[PDB]
């Protein structure tokens, strides 16, 4: 089973620990068995713990008051850990979703290792780099190349990214 | 995927409390645009719900 991975936090930093200061808000992940969609889609919201960023909210639209309810990344540490424990993680600079999910998990101080430890991490930008050198491998410039429609989509927030970045890692590896 | 929509509502009605920080660009009437009518008897009450959230914001302890 591939899973696809899309993390959505509270804005990034540019100096030093572009995780530390910083929570994650939203987690959107989908499962992809034998080159199709299983429907097993991984979508819950966090806590924002702090004031969601200026930037990041003209982004794709999230206020603090929404993840108000919404329960915290220790709710769902052994729910997401078990999830993609053991599997492959495609997601589009890992650097950034990793560094922030090993961050949380720092933040529960139960021994928990690094992700990188337990699941073999992958990252989808580092292959459109070496396919397309020079050129914008962005999200939204990988959706436009392979003619994938991005903002006609029900799904809205990581979900929507991680749905997009499965379609583009299937047909890079089609 | 009934509540996949349903989710999606409390996302757009949260944008109303974004209105007593009106520092950045935020188009309240876009919401109204973004949620159809088919929800509107959820939304009727997402605003009370998100208008008391913006009072107290966060607060941890
Ligand atoms: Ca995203």
């Known amino acids: 089973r591939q899973i696809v991975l899309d993390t959505e936090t509270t804005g990034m930093n540019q100096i030093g620990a572009h995780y530390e200061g910083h929570k ?119 959706c436009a190349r392979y003619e994938i429609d991005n903002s006609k989509r029900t799904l809205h927030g990581a979900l929507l990214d991680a749905q997009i970045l499965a379609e583009v890692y299937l047909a890079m590896t089609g | 995927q009934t509540e996949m929509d349903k989710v999606n509502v409390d996302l757009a009605a949260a944008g109303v409390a974004f209105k007593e920080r009106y520092n950045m660009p935020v188009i309240a009437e876009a919401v109204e645009r973004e949620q159809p009518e088919h929800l509107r008897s959820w939304f009727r009450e997402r605003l009370i719900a998100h208008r008391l959230a913006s009072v107290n914001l966060s607060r941890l302890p």
């Open chain 1, 24 to 142: 994650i808000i939203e987690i959107g992940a989908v499962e992809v068995v034998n080159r199709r969609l299983t429907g097993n889609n991984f979508h819950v919201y966090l806590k924002p713990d702090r004031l969601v960023d200026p930037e990041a909210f003209g982004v794709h639209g999230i206020a603090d008051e929404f993840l108000l309810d919404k329960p915290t990344f220790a709710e769902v540490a052994d729910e997401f850990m078990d999830y993609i424990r053991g599997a492959e993680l495609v997601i589009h600079n890992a650097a950034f979703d990793i560094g922030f999910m090993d961050y949380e998990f720092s933040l529960l101080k139960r021994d928990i290792p690094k992700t990188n430890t337990f699941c073999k991490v992958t990252d989808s930008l580092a292959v459109a780099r070496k396919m397309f050198p020079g050129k914008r491998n962005s999200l939204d410039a990988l």
